[PDB]
Write a protein that binds this DNA or RNA. Structure first.
Ligand code: NA
Ligand code: NA
Length: 327
DNA sequence: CATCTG
DNA sequence: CAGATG
């Protein structure tokens, strides 16, 4: 956790790089298990050889750990931190819609900057365009004070369109959090479940309203169950308009809301712990259900949940307010 | 994993 | 349809 930090750090720098610049998934994947094991590792890695002793730790990494331990640096890391190419890739990637893949193409075409991009707005697609247009806004966290205001609009509109809708804003917002990166809504309806053959309108009607009133400004991707867009809190009395924010809305069969709701709410750590506890309790959980674990190895049959309560109940545990869902 | 692009 | 992105 702090005993082998540099190591684990350089290891991650390297890994990332393989994957983003080179195309080196194998290698990339290599650096990663390496950082992971050394991570769990209990002592002070004092040399390569000590390290090598670890699974996932080959001669190559070992070599690196040496130079690093030997000198506060690593030539490779040194070289890579300069290379404008590598940098451009790291940068372009920040644009929403531009992945590494794209980042590679663009660079080879000489587009390495924000300006480069605007100039070539033509080579970018819709997402990518939007993503370039709100680059600033997009990196700006979202303060609860706005989140509450956002949440308020969304729920009220959902309600209007159908009294029977059930919306929930998950994420850290849900666990208390002072700010957040984007708004995530879970949506369901009675008339929508496991079996129930579709009802696309279910998502689309809401989306529509949200744009009706102007809350939603752009569409990143609209599917029949997942919406990826942009919204904005109406600028009050002109002087201070709000940054554009990412927002997503997803339709879920009512018969599997809570697990999802539970699930999305995190944190990753709270999940796992519960997940692992579920297991003890003779259960299983995943993003959509909770199944009674047979003994034959495994077994299924989705246990029936009407709230986040039912879930906990099942694994016989303490209902935790979302705030305490930390770890 | 679901959506897009081409 | 593969392949890319979130
Ligand atoms: Na990106
Ligand atoms: Na292939």
């Amino acid at each position: 956790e702090t005993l082998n930090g540099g190591i684990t750090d350089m290891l991650t720098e390297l890994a990332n790089f393989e994957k983003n610049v080179s195309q080196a998934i194998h290698k990339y994947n290599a650096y990663r298990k390496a950082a992971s094991v050394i991570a769990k590792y209990p002592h002070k890695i004092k040399s390569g050889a000590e390290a090598k002793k670890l699974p996932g730790v080959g001669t190559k990494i070992a070599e690196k750990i040496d130079e690093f331990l030997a000198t506060g640096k690593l030539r490779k890391l040194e070289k890579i931190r300069q290379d404008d190419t590598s940098s451009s890739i790291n940068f372009l990637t920040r644009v929403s819609g531009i992945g590494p893949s794209a980042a590679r193409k663009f660079v080879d075409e000489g587009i390495k900057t924000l300006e480069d991009l605007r100039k070539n707005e033509d080579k970018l697609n819709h997402h990518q365009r939007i993503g370039l247009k709100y680059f600033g806004d997009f990196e700006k966290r979202i303060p609860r004070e706005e989140m509450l205001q956002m949440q308020d609009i969304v729920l009220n509109e959902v309600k209007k369109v159908d009294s029977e809708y059930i919306a929930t804003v998950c994420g850290s917002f849900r666990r208390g959090a002072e700010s957040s990166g984007d708004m995530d809504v879970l949506l369901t309806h009675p008339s929508f479940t496991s079996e129930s053959t579709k009802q696309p309108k279910l998502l689309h009607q809401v989306v529509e309203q949200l744009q009706k009133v102007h809350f939603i400004t752009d569409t990143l991707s609209k599917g029949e169950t997942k919406f990826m867009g942009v919204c904005q809190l109406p600028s009050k009395n002109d002087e201070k308009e709000y940054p554009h924010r990412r927002i997503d809305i997803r339709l879920i069969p009512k018969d599997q809301y809570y697990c999802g709701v539970l699930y999305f709410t995190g944190s990753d750590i709270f999940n796992k712990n519960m997940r692992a506890h579920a297991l003890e309790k003779g259960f299983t959980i995943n993003e959509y259900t909770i199944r009674p674990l047979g003994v034959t190895g495994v077994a299924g049959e989705p246990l029936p949940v009407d709230s986040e309560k039912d879930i906990f109940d099942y694994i016989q545990w303490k209902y935790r307010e979302p705030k305490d869902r930390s770890e």
